[PDB]
Amino acid sequence: GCCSDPRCRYRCR
């Protein structure tokens, strides 16, 4: 999940 991943701090969409 990007919302919880550190590489997807804001890229959850």
Side-chain angles (χ1 to χ4, degrees):
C2 269
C3 270
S4 63
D5 210 43
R7 313 219 201 186
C8 256
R9 49 199 168 183
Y10 280 93
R11 311 186 102 203
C12 196
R13 262 219 52 73

